[PDB]
């Protein structure tokens, strides 16, 4: 069909907006807050989905950051790689290939974000990529 | 339609299970053995598809590991990046961004896994990502 | 439906061929010039989509290479990661995980290619991955 709007909301009430398409056993879902743009004819700007410490579960093990969500859809997605920028508490930052999934636990959707080791605690993760998940239902 | 079960089998008789959907010129296929889970409310476990030396062709050139398969479907897929853990014979291991495709040769499906150089011979590759391929047929 | 042929053309008249499928709000598009092959039973060859300096806009900021295109389709795609080889003017080269999108500016399609810093100016970028974009329209 045509693309339907939706959103998830984080623990700190951040709204993550998306559009989706739901066919037979298929759900395709794109996050739409950070679609990058050419702002003039020579410059491309990435936009970030910004996720702070307070959006993650504690304790964090093995560079796995879990973002409990409310609302939206309940899918076991595949893993997608993304561009991350991981900001440490001392404001240093590392660009990384991150790996993201949507999973369901206790009937709730969670975003799983895995990245590499950093020399410090993380203040914030920015997803700089446009994320789209193709998912199989049932 | 609804999602149909299938599998490939490796040279050592490892079974790689998947579900798929086949529409007009479109085949979407997800490997389902290693769907990660939140096992309690704070911990996410990745699962691995584990591929050993004996599942690969010899000789291996340019960090390209070829896994001949039997059964399943015959597709020329796009390339997907994945999380790999590459275990060396001396049990050291390296986490890498791997790149995976399905290709067909002599009427047989093969999984192509490319990764980075490692200081040793590889005993095992673990794919820690949930893999889904969207493929164009004909 | 069945897969339709198309192409984009670069500033230097390089033709980038693709096949696509356009359903309701959905456009799936695969670039087809560099489908890798097993050429004998033990060897896999990657093929490259080769993009030179003259195919990019100037000035280049933040390791973002913008390839203005003509013809083809007009989509705001998600970001896909790919295998790049980035060739410097002194012929040294770096293998990287690149991130690619299609975007539209002034009614024209552009391919956005982002990679990592390199110690020199880039002569050429080779995309060694088979690229397929799943896109949401409207
Ligand atoms: C990836 C996956 O399978 N997730 C499932 C989890 C885990 O399987 C449990 O940890 C097993 O106890 O179980 C559910 O019943 C749940 O609690 O919501 C459904 C959910 O989809
Ligand atoms: C990616 C690709 O094109 N693979 C094709 C190969 C190679 O083209 C051959 O190496 C050309 O001789 O050829 C086939 O006939 C084959 O042997 O099964 C079909 C297969 O899909
Ligand atoms: C990602 C995105 O939104 N791109 C859009 C751009 C930018 O929004 C402009 O920079 C805003 O002025 O605007 C268009 O009208 C354009 O010039 O073709 C449509 C295009 O799809």
């Amino acid at each position: 069909g045509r693309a339907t709007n939706g959103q998830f909301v984080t623990k700190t009430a951040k709204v993550l907006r998306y559009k989706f398409v739901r066919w037979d056993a298929l759900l395709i879902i794109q996050f739409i807050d950070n679609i990058g743009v050419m702002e003039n004819p020579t410059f491309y700007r990435n936009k970030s989905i910004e996720l702070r410490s307070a959006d993650f579960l504690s304790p964090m093990l093995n560079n796995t950051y879990i973002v409990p969500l409310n609302g939206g859809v309940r899918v076991e997605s595949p893993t997608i790689p993304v561009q991350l920028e991981v900001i440490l508490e001392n404001n240093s930052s590392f660009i990384q290939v991150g790996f993201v999934r949507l999973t369901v636990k206790n009937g709730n959707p969670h975003m799983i974000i895995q990245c590499n080791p950093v020399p410090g605690n993380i203040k914030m993760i920015k997803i700089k990529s446009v994320m789209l998940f193709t998912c199989l239902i049932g």
Side-chain angles (χ1 to χ4, degrees), chain A residues 8-9 11 57 66-76 101-112:
Chain A
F8 296 106
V9 181
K11 257 176 154 68
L57 295 185
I66 304 185
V67 180
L69 300 161
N70 268 96
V73 304
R74 297 188 156 85
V75 292
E76 289 303 327
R101 276 197 76 216
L102 303 174
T103 195
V104 178
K105 182 55 174 200
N106 300 146
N108 287 97
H110 294 72
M111 186 178 287
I112 311 294

Side-chain angles (χ1 to χ4, degrees), chain A residues 56-69:
Chain A
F56 307 133
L57 295 185
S58 214
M60 179 288 297
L61 294 173
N62 289 95
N63 289 106
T64 299
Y65 302 81
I66 304 185
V67 180
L69 300 161

Side-chain angles (χ1 to χ4, degrees), chain A residues 64-109:
Chain A
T64 299
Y65 302 81
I66 304 185
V67 180
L69 300 161
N70 268 96
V73 304
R74 297 188 156 85
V75 292
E76 289 303 327
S77 77
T79 301
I80 70 166
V82 303
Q83 303 162 273
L84 289 186
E85 186 173 9
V86 170
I87 320 301
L88 297 191
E89 263 156 21
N90 67 1
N91 289 324
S92 42
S93 90
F94 302 80
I95 301 292
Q96 288 177 357
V97 187
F99 288 91
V100 184
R101 276 197 76 216
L102 303 174
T103 195
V104 178
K105 182 55 174 200
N106 300 146
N108 287 97

Side-chain angles (χ1 to χ4, degrees), chain A residues 35-39:
Chain A
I35 302 169
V37 282
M38 289 178 67
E39 297 211 348

